[PDB]
Amino acid sequence: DSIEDKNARVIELIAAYRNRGHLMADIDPLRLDNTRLTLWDLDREFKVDVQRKKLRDILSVLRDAYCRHVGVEYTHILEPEQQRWIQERVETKHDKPTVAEQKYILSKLNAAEAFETFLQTKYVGQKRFSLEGAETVIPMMDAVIDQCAEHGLDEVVIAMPHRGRLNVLANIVGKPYSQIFSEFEGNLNPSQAHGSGDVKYHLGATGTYIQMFGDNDIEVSLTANPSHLEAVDPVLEGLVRAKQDLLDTGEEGSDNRFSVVPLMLHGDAAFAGQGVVAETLNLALLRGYRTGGTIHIVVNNQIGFTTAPTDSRSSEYCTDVAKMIGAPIFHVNGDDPEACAWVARLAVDFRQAFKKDVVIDMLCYRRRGHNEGDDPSMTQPYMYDVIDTKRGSRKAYTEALIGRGDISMKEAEDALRDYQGQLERVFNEVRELEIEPSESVEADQQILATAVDKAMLQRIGDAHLALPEGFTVHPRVRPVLEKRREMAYEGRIDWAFAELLALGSLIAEGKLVRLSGQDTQRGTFTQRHAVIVDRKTGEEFTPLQLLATNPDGTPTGGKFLVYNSALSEFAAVGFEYGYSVGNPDAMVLWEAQFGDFVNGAQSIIDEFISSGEAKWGQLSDVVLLLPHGHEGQGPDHTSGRIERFLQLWAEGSMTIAMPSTPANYFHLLRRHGKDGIQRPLIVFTPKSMLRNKAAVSDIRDFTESKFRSVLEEPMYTDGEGDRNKVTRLLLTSGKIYYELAARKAKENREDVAIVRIEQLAPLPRRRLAETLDRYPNVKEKFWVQEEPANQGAWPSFGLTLPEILPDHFTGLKRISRRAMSAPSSGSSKVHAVEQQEILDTAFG
Amino acid sequence: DKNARVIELIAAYRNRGHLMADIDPLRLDWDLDREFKVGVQRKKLRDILSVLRDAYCRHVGVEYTHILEPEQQRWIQERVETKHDKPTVAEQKYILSKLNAAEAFETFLQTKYVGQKRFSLEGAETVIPMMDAVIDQCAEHGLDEVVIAMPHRGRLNVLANIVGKPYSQIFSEFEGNLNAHGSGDVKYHLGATGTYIQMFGDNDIEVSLTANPSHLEAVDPVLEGLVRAKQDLLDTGEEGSDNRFSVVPLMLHGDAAFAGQGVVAETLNLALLRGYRTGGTIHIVVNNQIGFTTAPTDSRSSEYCTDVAKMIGAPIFHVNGDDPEACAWVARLAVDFRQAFKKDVVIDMLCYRRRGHNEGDDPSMTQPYMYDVIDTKRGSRKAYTEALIGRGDISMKEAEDALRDYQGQLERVFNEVRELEKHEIEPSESVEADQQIPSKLATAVDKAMLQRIGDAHLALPEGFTVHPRVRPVLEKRREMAYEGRIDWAFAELLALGSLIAEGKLVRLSGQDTQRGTFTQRHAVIVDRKTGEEFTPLQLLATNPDGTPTGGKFLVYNSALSEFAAVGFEYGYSVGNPDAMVLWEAQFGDFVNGAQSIIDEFISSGEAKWGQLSDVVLLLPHGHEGQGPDHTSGRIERFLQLWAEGSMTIAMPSTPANYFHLLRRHGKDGIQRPLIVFTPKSMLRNKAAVSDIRDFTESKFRSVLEEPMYTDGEGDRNKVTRLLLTSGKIYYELAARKAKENREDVAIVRIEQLAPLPRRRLAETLDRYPNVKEKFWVQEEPANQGAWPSFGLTLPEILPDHFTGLKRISRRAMSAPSSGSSKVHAVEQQEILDTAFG
Ligand SMILES: CC1=C(CCOP(=O)(O)OP(=O)(O)O)S/C(=C(/O)CCC(=O)O)N1Cc1cnc(C)nc1N
Ligand SMILES: CC1=C(CCOP(=O)(O)OP(=O)(O)O)S/C(=C(/O)CCC(=O)O)N1Cc1cnc(C)nc1N
Ligand SMILES: [Ca+2]
Ligand SMILES: [Ca+2]
Ligand SMILES: [Mg+2]
Ligand SMILES: [Mg+2]
């Protein structure tokens, strides 16, 4: 009504465009959804933040920035400087691309569409999950990578699903067309045939991107992945984080460049529905997981196979999950490749300025069916009636560039004729060039002293008392530090100290050690104390970090990276798997709170850890620490599901162990870090046995011994025990050994021997046969276990042991809990009665 | 100019005031008299600012300007930016009684069971009066039930002080003396049911608490499923006549678990979906600013633990746990918002954890600053009590007497319990015999029923335009119903349609389940010209005379989730035991995304909690050369999980046997999950078809012989080699036998993998007296499929029949299959050549 009233209505209007203008922006190239102050005041001047501008001018700047082909979501960001940064770059006149840059974009759209159309012609009946209707993804990714090269970064690491995967591999990464054509030909040379393999749209590649108009180059990698959509997200993060740590960039680096950029592509239905997306975004700013911001690209073809977005998500945008970490979101029209390239460059600039994630929602469509053989009009007839009227983005942009006067019709035709002639000469060459069953990858990696000097044990012990000046140790943490120095010099080394002796000795030898998991710094069972907290100030101290410096003051090259993970299994296990792939020379350990929670990461275990080598030739040396054992804490605090990992095992893909002594655990970890084999290690670790006074080791077991896959009772190897008196053999693994040994001693049963299987997979066949041959008077052999009959090692051992060793194990019987639906009973009293029945049966 | 600066200030408070609000009980981190323009009324700046400070910068942080619906922003704004009437002395006293019960229950167990883990709510006592206000507000709206799901934090306190679980039952559990059945679970995993009666109102409401494992947040989709089934039974909500959503999910969370677990996002993503919505969940985050020894800085990459809830535009209220009046008020506002917009609401209760993570843990080892502050802090109960003695509401004597009365009541129940005669502790027993199958059960239907389901596919609405490639499916189904040669996809719909016709509620969902991943189902058909939907099976919900059967066909395309979708269907089946609930995986290879649900609820829920579920998992399975993720439903994993007859596991080879399996499952009266390994290419195998007689005069066959012996000129006595198999490999083996005229070889199919059909298998094998060798033949690698369990169990349960049983399979493999279809083809031929070698 007044001057103060009008100037106030304008400020609300400005805010309305900045907050909700994205809901009006012309972002959908299909235009499916139909429902998507006075006139004298437009020429009046108003106060804007400090200059005076006309309302018409304020309105035109706002409609240009927020209501054209780019929908900007940023007012949810809590940091005001990030809101100002976006506002300043979005609310200004944008410099038009040069004719050369426009021609370059069209060349990318040409190769994108001509690649898809060549495959439709040659291999009409072969699934390729085409990028048709989304070809702008190619110039957009090219702009992301080019912008990264402009900032002088070292590498872009890509992870993506099926949508236009082959197109990306050929036109962004640089994977030869001959290789991609040999895969459709179904004829692979012995190197491409090796292992069991995977489908062509799961494969990765590496290359060097060279700037078209710049002088920089950048490494471009694409990681392998399963069909399981979004499963590769935390794997990419881990991979990038390991590479950043090697380059001394990022979080654990001297420079704050985060010079390895994660570029993560997603489908619209997969991005909204999969939980691992939220779990992975939740890591984006964590000290132990951040990679300085990921560039996310959502290929939003407004469809997920036959499912409409209305049935796929409960939110406006498929990208709304990214608001949880305050990521800016750019919804961009896939038919405007210049707006797509510009947004991609802005996204990289934002990542570089704030070391935070950025989401690009590319609104497009899927020209053909879900796969190339599918008819989408059965379920989406309206959408496909609209798509059938739509001229592709390539034709649209070509007609735009001719009208502008940039290129001629002849120049456009010739450019496509050249590219079509090139694909045909490559296809002919491969076509011009016997299928056998897949072979096991076991022999692919074959290959050891793990003992350390007394001085090394003493150094790791002393490190626990080499406290900074003034440091106030918690009075209940102080005895751990003092008892460890004593253990290092006097023996009776417990499990938790043996672990740190192995990690510390590896650090001292120059190895990078990464250890993480839930409450892993202290230890779930208050046993580790890898990090100690000053009682008065809260300052942290990591005793093992002192081992990264030689006594002369020089660095060993080693480092101790220990973290408390977020409350995740899927993303945390994915990340550590990725980290180990990213740095094969690192010692990477992930610890479950209890092994019962690793089933939250079942997709990682099944799709990456146990099978990644056979499927993609991708090697990982990740260690999974799974606290395991029947102690009466209930069905979710008892089992690490040994039977599942043993079932998954084949082709020597993993090592699976359940060590019974601290020294054997020490040697197992050192063998794993020093063997030069990149294969995952699954370890079933103790809980109560951490504080079992019988479960301790002598210094000579660390300094003069090695890993023992099979263990005999000390009375026959280092004592006065007679192996010829033994009539009954009890074969076992884990903590049940001490309970059986205590019963044998109590009853003086010289007729019974207890043999421990420390390495569950691969089965130590020769070692087991050699050990059993030392007991010639054995009349009966029993596999004894705590676990229910359908769980533990019995389901695999009961079947494999009589087969691999018939002369030793024909007639092998089982002593265990009954078969159970849950891993144990809920009552500790019921556990106690069942545990005593096992001991009574074994000695009956 | 000034009026414009005032509007920016109003917006600043509404948008960012929550970042200044005094929400943390630990505290760890001139123009004012002028009138301004703000219906359109003129208000002084002092009053504008007072309203803004009271609403957004005191003990309540309000996050709502992210909500895209303007009407929802106006609704919150109007209720938050007004003077709030102070609670009556009676209401304040009622809140104190709740704080009294909460802290005295925790202090009583500390005194009596010093050495037992109870995950105390000390420092978060306000959770109890807050939950009481949520439930009371639901009763005020005249709703029917509140269904609760929560983790460990103050679980026993909630059971005793909100749900109504007897103290005697809770004490008897700490005493380790139980009057228990199945293998059971820990006390803070248990559920209860009861009736809440309003203190100052005339209404009552049912209050239920669901069971759950240690796996944090895994119960979230299960609660939604449970609520959805109850809402469908009451004809309320999405599939109901009235839009009341009269059953309320009340979901409690811990701050670290809410930020870190993916299933939270997956479950919020369901909140407005047609097939999953429950009309809005009330979320309560017990934000004690700690997760065991982990600081929030290591737990999340966002300001608030609740930021994940902004993806569905849920309003978020950050409330100071030391202000129980503000907590009760926010809880009531939450219920009012849920009722008005049928959307989720998140209450972030900022509190602390008085003791260690568990009662035996020392938290100062890792959080000495936090525990130095907590040891200076007077509890919420003492604070509130002192504020009341200060306001003049109550005397010191009245406060003491109330605590003495409650403490005396606890001591009397504890002693009565202690006085009970102890029982001898025995090992847990198998729950197998708890649910007995009716020996003989009729699943056959009349030919008229098949014909009705066939005719329903052509009973199209007037003017409906069928897609030309969908039309032959509809016509071929009417022909199959009258003439036979019924394929797998039609037998599925014959089973579901016959159940609907008999009055059963059928819920079928999964990824692209309406059409079918393999374009086979067409449960829903789409008008080619308009896009209008038509569900032929829905016509079976009406009898020929026009009356309802009571049955219903609920078929949906799920979101792209496994964990939340499997969790939801598990919950749905628990919520309505009389419903037929089927969840379909796109390929069985993706069910490992829901491994926590399979391991913690489906396979073990009966033995742990006595919780029964009849959920059906449909897992497309088979070696066809599509790669390691499009081949196996991990049969070996489900067989390994099986014990105590907890589940039925089948791999049917004929459409009729699948039909009878589904009907037996829906009509047996047993509430046990069914795992079905279903076909892909075999859906279109012309040999894999059934006669009408198999649906009308037969029953489910756990073991199947070759038709040449049961219905042909085959001679069983000529058989010297027996091949034992399951699934689609049967047709390839049968085709090879026919090609080579091998009368010396017989192929026996095991249709029901678990429980093993011991008697039928023994009776079948006895019909082949000249057998000299038996082989288990399978497509799956040696360490996979049925061999790992059958190779061990078959020679044990049937030694006279299976001693010397050998295996024919793919080699043991790390991946479920090779990546090349050419390599699959060569391996498949080697199996067939070995079996007939
Ligand atoms: C549901 C599903 C698909 C629909 C994906 O929808 P979007 O995310 O919008 O992607 P597009 O529209 O296809 O670009 S593709 C798909 C495939 O099999 C990928 C092709 C492959 O690599 O094999 N699956 C099946 C599927 C279901 N659940 C999970 C966790 N992962 C899956 N891959
Ligand atoms: C990590 C973890 C806990 C810390 C939880 O932190 P918050 O969410 O902030 O909860 P509180 O502070 O304890 O209220 S409790 C817990 C327990 O086992 C509770 C006792 C029980 O229920 O048996 N686990 C272990 C855990 C790890 N991962 C998964 C998926 N679930 C878990 N339960
Ligand atoms: Ca290694
Ligand atoms: Ca049933
Ligand atoms: Mg899509
Ligand atoms: Mg907490």
Curated annotation (Swiss-Prot), chain B:
Effect of residue 152 to A: Loss of KG decarboxylase activity
A GO term, aspect molecular function: thiamine pyrophosphate binding
Annotated binding of acetyl-CoA, by residue: 648, 664, 699, 702, 752, 759-760
A GO cellular-component term linked to this record: oxoglutarate dehydrogenase complex
Keyword Electron transport: no
Disruption phenotype: Cells lacking this gene do not show any ODH activity, in contrast to wild-type, demonstrating that this protein is part of a functional ODH complex in mycobacteria.
Activity modulation notes: Alpha-ketoglutarate dehydrogenase and decarboxylase activities are inhibited by unphosphorylated GarA, and allosterically activated by acetyl-CoA, the main substrate of the TCA cycle. Both the phosphoadenosine and acetyl moieties of acetyl-CoA are important for activation because neither CoA nor the synthetic compound S-(2-acetamidoethyl)-ethanethioate (which mimics the terminal acetyl-phosphopantetheine group of acetyl-CoA) has an activation effect.
Pathway per the UniProt entry: Carbohydrate metabolism; tricarboxylic acid cycle; succinate from 2-oxoglutarate (transferase route): step 1/2; Carbohydrate metabolism; tricarboxylic acid cycle; succinyl-CoA from 2-oxoglutarate (dehydrogenase route): step 1/1
Residues that hold thiamine diphosphate according to the record: 153, 214, 216, 255-257, 288
Binding site for 2-oxoglutarate: 189, 214, 630
Effect of residue 630 to A: Loss of KG decarboxylase activity
Known EC number: 2.2.1.5, 4.1.1.71, 1.2.4.2, 2.3.1.61
Known outcome of mutating residue 672 to A: Loss of activation by acetyl-CoA
Cofactor or coenzyme needed: Mg(2+); thiamine diphosphate
Gene Ontology BP, a term: tricarboxylic acid cycle
Top-level taxonomic group: Bacteria
Region of interest (2-oxoglutarate dehydrogenase E1, C-terminal part), ranges: 1-837
Functional note: Shows three enzymatic activities that share a first common step, the attack of thiamine-PP on 2-oxoglutarate (alpha-ketoglutarate, KG), leading to the formation of an enamine-thiamine-PP intermediate upon decarboxylation. Thus, displays KGD activity, catalyzing the decarboxylation from five-carbon 2-oxoglutarate to four-carbon succinate semialdehyde (SSA).
Domain comment, as recorded: Is a fusion protein with two major domains exhibiting structural features of an E1 and E2 protein, and a short sequence stretch of E1 localized at the N-terminus, which is connected by a linker region to the rest of the protein.
Protein name as catalogued: Multifunctional 2-oxoglutarate metabolism enzyme
Provenance organism: Mycolicibacterium smegmatis (strain ATCC 700084 / mc(2)155)
Boundaries of the shown chain within the full protein: 365 to 1227 of 1227
